[PDB]
Amino acid sequence: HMKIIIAGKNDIAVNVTRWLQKKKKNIEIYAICNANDTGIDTFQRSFKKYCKDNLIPIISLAEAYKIDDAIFLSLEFDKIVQPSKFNHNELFNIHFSYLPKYKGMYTSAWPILNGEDTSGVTLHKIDHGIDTGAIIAQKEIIIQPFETAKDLYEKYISEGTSLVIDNISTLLNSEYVEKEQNIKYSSYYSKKTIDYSNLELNFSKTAFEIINQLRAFTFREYQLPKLDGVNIFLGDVLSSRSIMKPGSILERNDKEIIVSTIDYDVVLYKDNFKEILEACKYSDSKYIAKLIRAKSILFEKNIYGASPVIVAAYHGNIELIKWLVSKGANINDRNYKGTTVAMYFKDYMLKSGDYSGLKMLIDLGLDLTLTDYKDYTVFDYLEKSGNKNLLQYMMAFMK
Amino acid sequence: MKIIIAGKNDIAVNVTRWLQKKKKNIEIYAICNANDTGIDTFQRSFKKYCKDNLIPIISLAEAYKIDDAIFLSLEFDKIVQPSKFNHNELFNIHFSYLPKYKGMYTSAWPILNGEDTSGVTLHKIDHGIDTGAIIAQKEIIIQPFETAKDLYEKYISEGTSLVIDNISTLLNSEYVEKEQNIKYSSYYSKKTIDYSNLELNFSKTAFEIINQLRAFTFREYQLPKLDGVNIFLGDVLSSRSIMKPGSILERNDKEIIVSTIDYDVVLYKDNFKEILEACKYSDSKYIAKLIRAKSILFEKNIYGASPVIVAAYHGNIELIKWLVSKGANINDRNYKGTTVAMYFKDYMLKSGDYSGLKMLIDLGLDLTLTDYKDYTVFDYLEKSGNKNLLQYMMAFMK
Ligand SMILES: Nc1nc(=O)c2c([nH]1)NC[C@@H](CNc1ccc(C(=O)N[C@@H](CCC(=O)O)C(=O)O)cc1)N2C=O
Ligand SMILES: Cc1cn([C@H]2C[C@H](O)[C@@H](COP(=O)(O)OP(=O)(O)O)O2)c(=O)[nH]c1=O
Ligand SMILES: Cc1cn([C@H]2C[C@H](O)[C@@H](COP(=O)(O)OP(=O)(O)O)O2)c(=O)[nH]c1=O
Ligand SMILES: [Cl-]
Ligand code: NA
Ligand code: NA
Ligand code: NA
Ligand code: NA
Ligand code: NA
Ligand code: NA
């Protein structure tokens, strides 16, 4: 007889709700969605789309205020909840910082920008204020020095998901503890603190700070940082210290732009992801290696979720797959419909008739049991297309 | 031995002064910052001190040619060519714990950002800005109650001592250098704060806004304002208004209460002026009721007069004892270097009542101190022919 209202967006809303349906089938779910959920799966899943496809009713916040016997759980939700319009106090939020620091907006950027080594996710009570209610559970997150705003956000989504799952029973059974947030070190950033319509690198800063600007503004689906309108994908601190005014362009080549700072010169790497992606169809690793300035560009994706590893698999480019995996690519990487590397590779196998590299991919960790967001395995697609012969081949190599 | 002092303000004066007393064989050349007006304000003019002490004033171009000098920058404002000197004895005092807080407004940014500490750094002048290898640092604890002005004064004081503590090593190539790290480096330009258009930001937490107050509280430049009304500090309240941050919840003659992102804040209206006036004649019981922030007791008017000075001038000894027990400086000075003892001396002359001198002495009054014309209180008594008071005060000297 319990009820829960899940209000928000992206993979956190989707995977928390999924868990509920799998492990809490018993509980009635109502969903609230954000204003800019279009019902189309982008780099994050559409929660609106998920709810419609699963017959989970979508309600408004107005209506949510009047359900007395429900828990309310907000996950990247875009609406100011007014707690007094509820007739209960079981209102919970996952905020993407280690509160009491970084209340408010852009928590994937500000910690990077300010030079933080760590951040966190915090489950808390909702009160009238913004990210101010009492803390229930938290988890510290390491921000690696290579990681971008995008990587950080994806960690938020992932850890935020687990924290909810590790606590949701206590929320449902009213078995949780709370602690008021401290005054000291409390910080907050409004939407006005960064103007993503007019984003600008500031070279009157240290190299350290400037590399953190790049990192903090590297979130491809929104933007990359620019210099003279040229997109940049990361950069490094050089050993030289130019006499010239900070902001002064020291060199341009095909791959990079070097710039004067307050202290050390920085090299900014021109974004060539699109060129790299094209090249991953047929080129060997030797050729890709020379294209690469920052190693992490190998794990970037275009607006459909296609990565270098995914493109490599689609064209059977097995020596490149191996290399990409050795550099840290995910052998089970997915695009934004959940289509896996193994599914792309199956297309290559059908087209070429060369099945011989499957065994080696399986040894790299390739997982044939995974399902896309229609809940199909590669096996279901083969059976549907009537390729029984390739189906049994693939079956025999899985583990 | 020989030294070029390039810079401005009290630290440059203090180090130069110290050198003329404790190392009278050293030759000194100065460079002054262009915008030194030659006139003392709440900071002393280095240019003025140099002209009055016949210290030669030279330019960067000249400094490059003096091969047997060390070059000491005490907030010098010009980029130098390090390698153009024929030596590498090139030093700078910077008012931060480097590599953090490179650049400008180092009395503000650390407080704004919620730091508990800062410091001063003696380092090499090298390529970059504020980036040369570290020679010696002093950590400074920034107390929760301390303003920009309090921190600036610690910088002056501690930087001066940093220099003095290390001056032999500087003159004799006997220091140890450690190149700075890059990690946690920060820098702020002069564009990062616009002091001609300061606005408090209330879309912030209580902690941040109190730290804004502190950071912007530097009376001789400005105080923070709400409704064009000046504020001297404030406090966090345990209540939490539903009203948009920045909404005024209450006002009276003492204070203004405002909504924040989290905890309501009380902003205390600046009543220093009222306090200073009252110090002429009120006792501590009355004064204590005017105070909303203890440290307003140590502010100064445009001449440099504090409560303890006004009290001494008026022979208000009961209040001096109290002020001192609150942390005041019994030897405070105005912007001419006129000490508390000099003001009290005037009171003794006007009153003919000398008996309170022992009480101030026991509170720590120092009569040997000198003003910026270099006179003690005894010298002024001499010049004025007040031989009786001079004899009375002299009786106290061991
Ligand atoms: N070569 C050299 N390096 C130094 O680090 C140094 C010297 N000389 N000489 C003395 C002092 C000078 N430090 C500075 C610091 C900032 C500006 C300056 O013009 N800053 C501007 C604008 C530049 C920008 O932001 O790009 C500002 O932001 O306020 C000038 C001199 N200094 C100490 O070691
Ligand atoms: C709106 C926006 C966000 N971002 C980054 C910073 C944010 O932390 C991150 C997620 O932003 P967003 O998708 O707005 O989610 P949330 O509002 O829940 O933080 O995306 C950009 O890089 N550019 C943008 O224009
Ligand atoms: C110029 C200025 C400085 N300050 C503070 C910030 C600084 O760290 C501190 C000392 O500055 P100061 O050494 O006077 O810097 P400047 O070269 O600009 O004179 O005073 C103000 O509060 N208001 C102001 O208008
Ligand atoms: Cl198929
Ligand atoms: Na209610
Ligand atoms: Na914005
Ligand atoms: Na530079
Ligand atoms: Na001259
Ligand atoms: Na300014
Ligand atoms: Na409030």
mmCIF file of C-alpha atoms in Angstrom, chain B residues 4 54 103 139 150 158 173 215 238 244 284 315 328 334:
data_model
loop_
_atom_site.group_PDB
_atom_site.id
_atom_site.type_symbol
_atom_site.label_atom_id
_atom_site.label_comp_id
_atom_site.label_asym_id
_atom_site.label_seq_id
_atom_site.Cartn_x
_atom_site.Cartn_y
_atom_site.Cartn_z
ATOM 1 C CA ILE B 4 67.219 48.966 -3.615
ATOM 2 C CA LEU B 54 67.570 62.019 1.663
ATOM 3 C CA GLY B 103 47.708 39.218 -7.694
ATOM 4 C CA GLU B 139 51.091 31.551 8.113
ATOM 5 C CA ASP B 150 42.453 43.489 10.299
ATOM 6 C CA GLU B 158 54.058 40.003 9.465
ATOM 7 C CA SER B 173 73.285 34.778 -0.409
ATOM 8 C CA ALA B 215 35.858 41.443 3.285
ATOM 9 C CA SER B 238 18.948 30.802 13.871
ATOM 10 C CA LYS B 244 13.358 35.839 -1.289
ATOM 11 C CA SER B 284 32.463 51.940 30.140
ATOM 12 C CA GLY B 315 41.847 61.887 30.601
ATOM 13 C CA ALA B 328 42.777 47.978 22.582
ATOM 14 C CA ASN B 334 47.306 58.523 14.702
#
